[PDB]
Amino acid sequence: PISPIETVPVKLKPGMDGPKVKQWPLTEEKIKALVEICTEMEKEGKISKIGPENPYNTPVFAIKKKDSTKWRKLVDFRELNKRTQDFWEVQLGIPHPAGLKKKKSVTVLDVGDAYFSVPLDEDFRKYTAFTIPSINNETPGIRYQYNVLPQGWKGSPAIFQSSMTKILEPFRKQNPDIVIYQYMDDLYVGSDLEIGQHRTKIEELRQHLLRWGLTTPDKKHQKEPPFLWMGYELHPDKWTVQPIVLPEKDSWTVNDIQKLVGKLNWASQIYPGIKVRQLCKLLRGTKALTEVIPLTEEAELELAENREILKEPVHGVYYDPSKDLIAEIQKQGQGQWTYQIYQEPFKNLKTGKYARMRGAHTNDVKQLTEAVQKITTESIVIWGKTPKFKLPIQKETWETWWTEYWQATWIPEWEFVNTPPLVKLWYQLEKEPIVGAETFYVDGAANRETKLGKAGYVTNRGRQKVVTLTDTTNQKTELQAIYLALQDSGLEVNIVTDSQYALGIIQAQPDQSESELVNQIIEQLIKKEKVYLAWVPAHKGIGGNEQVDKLV
Amino acid sequence: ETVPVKLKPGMDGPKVKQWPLTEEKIKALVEICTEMEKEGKISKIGPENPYNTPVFAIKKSTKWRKLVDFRELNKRTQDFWEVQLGIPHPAGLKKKKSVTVLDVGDAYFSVPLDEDFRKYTAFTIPSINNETPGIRYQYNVLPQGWKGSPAIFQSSMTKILEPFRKQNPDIVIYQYMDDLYVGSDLEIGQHRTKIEELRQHLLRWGLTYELHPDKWTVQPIVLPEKDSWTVNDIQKLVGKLNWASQIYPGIKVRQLCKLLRGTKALTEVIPLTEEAELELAENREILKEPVHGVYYDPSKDLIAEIQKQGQGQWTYQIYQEPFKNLKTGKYARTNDVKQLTEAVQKITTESIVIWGKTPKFKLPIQKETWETWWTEYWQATWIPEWEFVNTPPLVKLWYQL
Numbered sequence: 001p002i003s004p005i006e007t008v009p010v011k012l013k014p015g016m017d018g019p020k021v022k023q024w025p026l027t028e029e030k031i032k033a034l035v036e037i038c039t040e041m042e043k044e045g046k047i048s049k050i051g052p053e054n055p056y057n058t059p060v061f062a063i064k065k066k067d068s069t070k071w072r073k074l075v076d077f078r079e080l081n082k083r084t085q086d087f088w089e090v091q092l093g094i095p096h097p098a099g100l101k102k103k104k105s106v107t108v109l110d111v112g113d114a115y116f117s118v119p120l121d122e123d124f125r126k127y128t129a130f131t132i133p134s135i136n137n138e139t140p141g142i143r144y145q146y147n148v149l150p151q152g153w154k155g156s157p158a159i160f161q162s163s164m165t166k167i168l169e170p171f172r173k174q175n176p177d178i179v180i181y182q183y184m185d186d187l188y189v190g191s192d193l194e195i196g197q198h199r200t201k202i203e204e205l206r207q208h209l210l211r212w213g214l215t216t217p218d219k220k221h222q223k224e225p226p227f228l229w230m231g232y233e234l235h236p237d238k239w240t241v242q243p244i245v246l247p248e249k250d251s252w253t254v255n256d257i258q259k260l261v262g263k264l265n266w267a268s269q270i271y272p273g274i275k276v277r278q279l280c281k282l283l284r285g286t287k288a289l290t291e292v293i294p295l296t297e298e299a300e301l302e303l304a305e306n307r308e309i310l311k312e313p314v315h316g317v318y319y320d321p322s323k324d325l326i327a328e329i330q331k332q333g334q335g336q337w338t339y340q341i342y343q344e345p346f347k348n349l350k351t352g353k354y355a356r357m358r359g360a361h362t363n364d365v366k367q368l369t370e371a372v373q374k375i376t377t378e379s380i381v382i383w384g385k386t387p388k389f390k391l392p393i394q395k396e397t398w399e400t401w402w403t404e405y406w407q408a409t410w411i412p413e414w415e416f417v418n419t420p421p422l423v424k425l426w427y428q429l430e431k432e433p434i435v436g437a438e439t440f441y442v443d444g445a446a447n448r449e450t451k452l453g454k455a456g457y458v459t460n461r462g463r464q465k466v467v468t469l470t471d472t473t474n475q476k477t478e479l480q481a482i483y484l485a486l487q488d489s490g491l492e493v494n495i496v497t498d499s500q501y502a503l504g505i506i507q508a509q510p511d512q513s514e515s516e517l518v519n520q521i522i523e524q525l526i527k528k529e530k531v532y533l534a535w536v537p538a539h540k541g542i543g544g545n546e547q548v549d550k551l552v
Numbered sequence: 553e554t555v556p557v558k559l560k561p562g563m564d565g566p567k568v569k570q571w572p573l574t575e576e577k578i579k580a581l582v583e584i585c586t587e588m589e590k591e592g593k594i595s596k597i598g599p600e601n602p603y604n605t606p607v608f609a610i611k612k613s614t615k616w617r618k619l620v621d622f623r624e625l626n627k628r629t630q631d632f633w634e635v636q637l638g639i640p641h642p643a644g645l646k647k648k649k650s651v652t653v654l655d656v657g658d659a660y661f662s663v664p665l666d667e668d669f670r671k672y673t674a675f676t677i678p679s680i681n682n683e684t685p686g687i688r689y690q691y692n693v694l695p696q697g698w699k700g701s702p703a704i705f706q707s708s709m710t711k712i713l714e715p716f717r718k719q720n721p722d723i724v725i726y727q728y729m730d731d732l733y734v735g736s737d738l739e740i741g742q743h744r745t746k747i748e749e750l751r752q753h754l755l756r757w758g759l760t761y762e763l764h765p766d767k768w769t770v771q772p773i774v775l776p777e778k779d780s781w782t783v784n785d786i787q788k789l790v791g792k793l794n795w796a797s798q799i800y801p802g803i804k805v806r807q808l809c810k811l812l813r814g815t816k817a818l819t820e821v822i823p824l825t826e827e828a829e830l831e832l833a834e835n836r837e838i839l840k841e842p843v844h845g846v847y848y849d850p851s852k853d854l855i856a857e858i859q860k861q862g863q864g865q866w867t868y869q870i871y872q873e874p875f876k877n878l879k880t881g882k883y884a885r886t887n888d889v890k891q892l893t894e895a896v897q898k899i900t901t902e903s904i905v906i907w908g909k910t911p912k913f914k915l916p917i918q919k920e921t922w923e924t925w926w927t928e929y930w931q932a933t934w935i936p937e938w939e940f941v942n943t944p945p946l947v948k949l950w951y952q953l
């Protein structure tokens with residue numbers, strides 16, 4: 001059928017005219033296929049023969065359908081598409097299973113010839129004109145235009161979905177207890193009715209759909225739960241990811257590893273603790289895709305843990321709108337966070353992992369706070385609600401960091417949970433200069449054209465020193481100079497620098513870094529008992545700055 | 553009768569995607585919108601409108617209000633609401649002892665919007681978990697939050713205010729977006745009486761806080777007045793002055809630096825010399841006054857930077873070129889993001905009153921954190937533009953109090 005629903009008005013982009021593309025010659029047998037097919041379609045109303053006036057045209061062709069002996073009709077809508085207006089994005093956003101509510105019974109209905117069942121804006125049909133070529137392209141071809149949504153035209157996905165949504169609205173309005181999801185040409189329908197009345201509601205809906213031009217599978221042809229959908233296995237009362245088989249191989253290609261990382265990342269939505277750090281380091285660099293990468297020790301072991309976590313089926317539950325959500329986060333290892341979200345411990349609605357560096361230097365308290373933020377946004381999308389958090393950090397630790405850190409922050413209601421490793425601050429810089437502690441005036445420098453650097457210090461106790469560095473930068477020498485003061489100093493030390501760069505880094509209390517220097521400087525700060533760090537304007541001629549500026 | 557509106561030449565409507573909203577806002581947004589729909593202010597739209605702007609709900613009291621983020625539309629119509637017909641900013645407003653701010657946005661709902669412009673005001677009400685299609689709408693009338701609405705209604709507004717302006721020649725009334733600003737030097741009781749008199753005129757046309765800009769003074773860079781001075785203290789001092797040296801003509805440091813002689817212990821106490829105690833004072837008096845040589849340039853964007861000072865204090869500067877401060881200030885007294893959200897609104901309010909313009913904000917926060925939370929605390933009808941920055945640690949203390 002062709003739905004009786006009203007059409008969506010459409011037009012070409014503002015300056016443009018419709019397509020005028022020449023139909024190329026086709027082989028005789030493709031010409032025969034097209035004639036039979038367009039004859040079928042024409043008798044269904046799908047297309048109409050058009051007069052000589054219509055100046056627009058769009059090429060067409062025919063292909064032998066799969067491994068069968070029927071043909072398909074393909075239209076090339078490139079030109080028309082480039083000239084057609086933009087539409088509302090079909091709809092961007094897929095429901096996550098963990099957001100779905102438990103259902104007693106669920107059914108899938110398959111919409112027949114979806115696109116060809118919806119009418120095309122009458123004013124627009126003329127621009128869909130196409131021509132079936134005569135043999136050897138000797139005589140004028142048979143010309144047609146579409147009356148329905150062509151397959152392949154820019155606007156069909158969006159006008160179809162809108163048409164369905166509009167058709168469904170009465171049904172939804174008279175059936176609020178019932179749940180329906182539109183994806184492409186599929187409808188899924190959930191109820192908390194028993195098999196009997198549910199089957200009855202499905203028929204009223206089919207009748208309603210057929211009243212509107214849309215044919216569906218009979219009570220016999222509707223697929224059974226559990227369904228595969230978007231990589232998921234849905235059951236009425238639980239959900240999981242669809243089967244994931246990790247291959248047994250002696251040799252892993254770059255392509256094998258990427259795909260393995262992909263499946264593992266996918267499974268981590270519901271399999272707790274999946275890790276891919278070690279496998280991911282392998283992907284590092286830049287081989288060819290067919291290149292073999294021997295697994296490291298810590299990668300072959302990582303595969304081991306994962307293969308274990310997966311050996312047994314795991315499902316997530318569905319969302320109860322009446323209850324709070326609880327999110328728990330653990331530090332796995334090196335910048336790797338994992339988390340679980342549940343309403344009844346420990347039946348997870350879903351799990352996940354967070355592993356991102358924001359900047360070259362951070363600390364566990366920053367990273368934890370970022371995972372919290374990532375999880376909060378995710379909860380808003382999936383449930384429209386923020387979770388209550390349980391975090392491996394003491395309220396005192398987090399309150400110490402937040403207050404004295406210069407960036408603003410905030411995380412929703414949370415409370416301490418003792419799941420080691422606990423996140424902590426590994427050292428605190430002093431807030432006032434230290435008495436009885438040597439003052440190191442440090443300074444580092446680099447000649448831009450040489451890549452040569454000197455780094456050094458003078459102290460109030462008269463200690464002095466300079467070390468030469470090669471291929472270094474200004475930024476590096478300033479960090480080396482502070483590193484030097486740290487190595488040569490006692491457990492308490494004041495350090496005066498003119499590098500805002502160095503001060504920024506260290507004052508942020510990093511506990512890990514991409515820089516070897518900074519990692520050492522950090523290792524050094526853990527050892528100290530008290531470090532006070534001070535900044536001074538360079539070259540302003542300051543008592544101690546001037547001194548070690550003359551040496552380096 | 554509608555006024556023809558068009559975008560800036562070449563460019564296309566906004567296609568800004570809707571943010572995730574909580575269950576509650578979505579609920580409130582549906583209620584509100586079905587009501588606006590049967591009053592004809594908005595109409596449902598089809599997929600042939602590809603445009604979008606974000607929407608959300610605020611409670612300013614407990615009453616949900618709809619707020620549409622027209623920053624992109626506004627940017628994309630900007631020639632229209634500024635340089636065709638536009639609203640003049642009176643310089644006397646910032647001088648008044650009392651300015652009252654009144655919401656008159658509800659007046660726009662009585663004016664038809666140019667039919668061919670309507671499609672650009674498209675917005676979407678999302679569903680949770682994307683389980684059903686968003687509810688899409690267009691405006692039929694002048695929308696709140698769009699900078700075109702007061703431009704178009706301006707003609708009706710002066711007519712409405714004409715009697716009251718005639719009867720009170722010394723009161724300044726300024727419109728910006730959905731608000732009226734009303735200033736006088738009347739004693740506060742009589743100022744209020746006049747605000748009420750004003751509301752009564754407004755009420756005959758379909759419209760139902762107090763600032764004291766006069767009492768705004770800059771927050772100088774503060775120079776400590778130490779009982780006793782250490783090397784550490786004197787080095788801080790020099791840095792602060794060093795930095796001020798690039799804003800304020802005449803700042804001097806050379807005497808003080810002389811006190812930093814050789815390589816001393818940070819904690820060593822040092823006597824302040826005759827010439828040093830003199831700079832100190834000279835620089836304070838300079839720091840007390842406005843920056844000589846800095847001026848507001850009408851063609852340039854205003855920028856506003858905010859630093860977290862801890863303990864609930866926040867410092868800020870307004871400038872067009874870095875370090876050329878038009879205005880500095882602080883704002884005081886829980887939740888970091890709540891305080892920041894409040895400080896932004898306050899600063900935007902002063903900025904509108906002073907220049908008739910909102911600043912582009914540099915916010916000391918993580919994009920993600922701000923975006924999750926700010927709508928929880930927003931109480932204003934506009935939204936300024938903003939970006940996110942890591943405060944250079946020094947800048948923070950140089951502005952500390």
Ligand SMILES: Cc1cc(/C=C/C#N)cc(C)c1Nc1ccnc(Nc2ccc(C#N)cc2)n1
Pocket residue numbers: 095099100101102103106108179180181188189190225226227228229234235236237238318683
């Ligand atoms: C988004 C969605 C995807 C599918 C996708 C179907 C497929 N394939 C099926 C339905 C019915 C829905 N819509 C909603 C809305 C609210 N709760 C639920 N719960 C729910 C849905 C399916 C199963 C099952 N089995 C269990 C509970 N579904």
